[PDB]
Target: Capsid protein VP1
Amino acid sequence: DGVGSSSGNWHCDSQWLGDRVITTSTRTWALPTYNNHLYKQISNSTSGGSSNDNAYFGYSTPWGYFDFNRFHCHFSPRDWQRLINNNWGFRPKRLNFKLFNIQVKEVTDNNGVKTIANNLTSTVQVFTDSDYQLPYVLGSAHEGCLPPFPADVFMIPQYGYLTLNDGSQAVGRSSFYCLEYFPSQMLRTGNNFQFSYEFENVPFHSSYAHSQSLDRLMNPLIDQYLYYLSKTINGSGQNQQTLKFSVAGPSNMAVQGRNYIPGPSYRQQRVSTTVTQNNNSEFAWPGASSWALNGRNSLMNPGPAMASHKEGEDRFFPLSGSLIFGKQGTGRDNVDADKVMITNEEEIKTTNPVATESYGQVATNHQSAQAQAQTGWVQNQGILPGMVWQDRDVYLQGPIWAKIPHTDGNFHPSPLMGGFGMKHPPPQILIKNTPVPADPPTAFNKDKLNSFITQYSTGQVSVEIEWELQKENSKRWNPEIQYTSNYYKSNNVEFAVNTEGVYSEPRPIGTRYLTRNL
Amino acid sequence: DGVGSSSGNWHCDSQWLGDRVITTSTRTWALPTYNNHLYKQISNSTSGGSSNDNAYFGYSTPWGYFDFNRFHCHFSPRDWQRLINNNWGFRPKRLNFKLFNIQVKEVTDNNGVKTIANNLTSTVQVFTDSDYQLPYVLGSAHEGCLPPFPADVFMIPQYGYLTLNDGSQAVGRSSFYCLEYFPSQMLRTGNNFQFSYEFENVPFHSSYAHSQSLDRLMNPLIDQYLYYLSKTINGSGQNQQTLKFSVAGPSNMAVQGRNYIPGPSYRQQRVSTTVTQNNNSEFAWPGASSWALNGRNSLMNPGPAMASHKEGEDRFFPLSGSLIFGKQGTGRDNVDADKVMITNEEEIKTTNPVATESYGQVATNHQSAQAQAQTGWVQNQGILPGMVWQDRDVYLQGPIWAKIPHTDGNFHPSPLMGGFGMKHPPPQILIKNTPVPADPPTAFNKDKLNSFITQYSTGQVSVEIEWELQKENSKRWNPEIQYTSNYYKSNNVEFAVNTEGVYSEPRPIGTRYLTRNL
Amino acid sequence: DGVGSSSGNWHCDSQWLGDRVITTSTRTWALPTYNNHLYKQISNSTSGGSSNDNAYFGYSTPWGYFDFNRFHCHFSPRDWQRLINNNWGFRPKRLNFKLFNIQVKEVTDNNGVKTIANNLTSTVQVFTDSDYQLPYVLGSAHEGCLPPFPADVFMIPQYGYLTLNDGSQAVGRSSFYCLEYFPSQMLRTGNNFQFSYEFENVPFHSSYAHSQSLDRLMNPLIDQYLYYLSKTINGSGQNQQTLKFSVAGPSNMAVQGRNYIPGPSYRQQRVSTTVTQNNNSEFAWPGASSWALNGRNSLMNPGPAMASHKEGEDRFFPLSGSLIFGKQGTGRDNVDADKVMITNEEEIKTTNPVATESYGQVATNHQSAQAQAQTGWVQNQGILPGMVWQDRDVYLQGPIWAKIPHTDGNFHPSPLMGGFGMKHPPPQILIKNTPVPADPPTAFNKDKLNSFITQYSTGQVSVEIEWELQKENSKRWNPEIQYTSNYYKSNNVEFAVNTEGVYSEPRPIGTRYLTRNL
Model:
């Protein structure tokens, strides 16, 4: 429109209908100039990397991008509490995104002092990768998302991508992408940008915990009509071999026939938070479970959805089997256990195997009069018919969605870090300040200009997402477990600001508090 | 429109339809003040020139101009690869040009420090020479075109022209052109400029290499019904003269009658890239082929489309018979052979003569019993009836079109540097910053003002060209030759940016990979 | 249709309308099995060739082809005489082609005796290269055309083609064509094949001889209003330099100004049919005029249309400047001059230069008081503005048309051997006997079958061509020159059969007997 007219209003609210909840969040953003308007080839050689497992090749772009792939970007703690305490499931339906109130500033430095002024004629470029023609980086748990607290002003992260690499070198199959080779809208201070997105059909997330275990689905009062081999010898010596059979009933539930079995496994090492119970050696990387791709080892992290620990074993965790969040103010490198928040998936112990245990035991020979029957620990077990399992729970500060890789085949493409897997997720939204050259020389020079006016941009961003709800219809008589704040007095209110205005999330919040039968 | 509203969007993409491809490219430009708003007479005396062959007379104008007469200004390397690997020919059809997001800046210097601010009321003037009333400088391979990389910001080249000269002096027939004597649109920051152009009908460029040679078009299994003189003497002495004739057949293809002959020639000197095979003397200018006009010698460069070298003779090149491109970062004067990229036209060896050979041999006397038959090397041969030839190939970084000179007569007006010749090519687009006088004196002075506010302008430029495609309908069984990247590992990806953000084109890319019969 | 019903009738006649003549010719053909149903790579190595100029690479196909690219295939001698004596020009208009009365025979050999029987169920495959996707071999004066005498039964020539070669080896750009990769009609004994073709617009062939010479177009009674420099010195000593001028008139026609000049040249060596006037040395190949392509020398044969000899110099011919036909029964290698028929182009001496002379003389220096004026013999001259020329005459036994090579440029694409040049000439008609395997083994073998029933096919072929005529409207008073038979008694009638039934053509017949002004 014009310089003196706002191009949008501040929309931040949650609307709770019967089967739907609409979340709207608005944030103020700041966008600097990245790479001084240049594309730069990057690799482990440029960053000084040495290990083969961490070698990479890619490019850093002068473009930024908007990321809102975390639940706290849309749900307040109270809204999250309502969702998790009142619904058996939820899923995103549609998306509305807006950029408005664009403000481009120029910075001039004379001598140790910088002056900031408006540049009303400068432009900012925005476009969406609706055709998914660029590498998708929103599927990784990267920082730079919209802040959970609406009053926080955030910096737009720089967009970068990786391609095929051989050490620090590239190959002929490696791809280079120029983001200026895409049509993009150019916005001055009076212009705004908006688009709508429809989520593809995804299953409802399981925001419930099973009230039954897979091995306890039988009637505890009635025998089965099936038999089991109870004895093989002749009880109370030589030549004592005689078959025996008994009815599988309530007294021996472990041997009853069952139609379904727990889901797959890939065993993790077990770590205690009581440090003196751990071995006196360096076992992080060495002791960890991993997978290999083209000679590179990548940590199995977080891996298959598996129960974090056995009942009562709360002190133990799988070495890389769980999402680890950092508390407010936590450092980047080598922080103590009290500075991080270790999530756990104990709710899925009713259907999923324990991460630090074998799947089970399997026969490994043919027993005879000369050879005793032998069994072997199944340390990893693939998908088998009749298996059932629960996916990893999602969290308030955890990811929402991920892009399913474009491959010939996949199985249960639920993101392993939690969330909704989609072939066509919300498109990447890329933003960049248009370069403004400084005064050029009065004589023609064919070289590209390298002198630009120092600029940055700021504005507001709004994203509205409609969520579909799956209401609970339980006939359970006793009250359910519910997420609740603790009344006991404390220096600060949980999920609030401190005396210095710092917002903090004191604990990870899952979604599985209500219960339903298996 | 207004100060705070963008006057255009960033359009940069390629759309591939069935028989048509539409290329759109957008670039950011910077325009300084040229000649301090003055017209200046220029000549070899003003530049210090001494040689007669390089003497000139002309004028330098305060106007800039937009040039997009190179293929890489519109085709990305991948689009170029698709075009050359999937089409037998192509030609431009129509043009769309846009100027928008005009930003005029003022520069003020206090003491060793410059401050840049917007001048919202200043104007930039743009007009197109649709009537071709000004000298056409886009027909020369000049620098200053739109960069191949969309992210590069480029400086608008200054417009200048030459007229008739006698040494460093002018004649009465010399013409002086004032570009302010043309109607031009004046644009503030809110205005935009656009026009459309239709290419005149031109033949499709030959993006194929012949799979047959002109001297091998006969059936290799059947004799001709024509005869040749095989012997003249009496074999196995004096008085031995007796005519003889034989059927021209597969065993002697060189003497068979043919309906068509190779195209014209103008012999070049041969230079080896193995330096020790060349003569130990200075032979550049002296040894070069040239033509003369009004007593001035101009290098025959690149000259008639001729095969660069004989089969297997890849180390040799014609002294000025081929387009020479410079690698990224190559200097201007006296660079080594590894700093430049020497194009070659070996694909046209099937119809065109070798640049460094005689056309052939011609009889020069009447043989008799006293005089032996004599022949002479035809070092240059003009057009003859029955001649066929292929024009010079075009390249990704090479020129696209040229203006056919307005003359009474011409023959095959295909530009010798490669491209499409047109009587009415895309018009010149001239741009200039309107002078903004400084504070004038409070007392009237009749002299023209010479104190102006230091200004420069910047903005975006978009050009869209629709290309018509000629699909291939070959019945060839074996696979064709195709342009392909090499998979082998390298420090950088070809046609990409370096670790410092520098875009480079590692090799010239022709168009002739597919094959068709002759 | 059926076995016992003819699929076509014998049509062989000429119909003379006012401005059109329709020629129909029917012949009986025989088609054997070529290459034993195989495709074979051929080269100068396979044929034992050694010279670089005769090196080639190509393939021989099991397919035959129909060729009617000679005038005597359609015109009887009487029809040719009428055409040449009554018309100033002619050109083909449309074509009708038919194959019918297919008869496929099987040959069985027991011991030194062969038995031939019908194979009613076998098929013959025919298709036309209407899209010109195969190498065109009809543009060379190859044998195997329809016989001039309707009663002669002819053998279908085998189809072969050449591709790019380096010595006896191929390159990546070389193409291999499989003719079974084309849709073709399969014909049993009851089926027939036919198609129609329309000739593209071509100029009328010049079947006239000019009654005026290019240097004698002025009025022999009136002076010109232009002057010439008659003297330079001071007639009847030193210091005698004085300019002079005279009117160019009838007394000095050589110096008169003229608007047009004779056409291009490329000098040939001169050979006498009186053997003792030739040099006592071997000068065929060495003394011949040639052109070079990719290091290979190809004889200039027949080359540019040039007058064969000066007036009265009938004993001389250009070494390779003229079409040479062989008399009936003439051998293939090293035959005497009386066994061949040397065509001549003396009719075009009025506009075209003499083949064995220089084009003219050109100044080679600047005359002065110290240096005498120098001139040089122009041994070859290219096209110049104002040039006029006549193309090579066509003959009864000579070629009719040729395919213009698909190139970017050409000049006056009239075939140098004579005839009509067309981008889309009559398509190649390819025919092959379908292989009929012998008894296969009773156990499966994956190798391709190599045991086939010996077969050949025979039938009739009819081609009808409509020719457009250009009637003469001369006002010449005296009778014209006409082609006529000689009444004087002879043992045999010219253009008839001998006592052994052998048809012979005793002389080449041109088309240029009528006259018109220049």
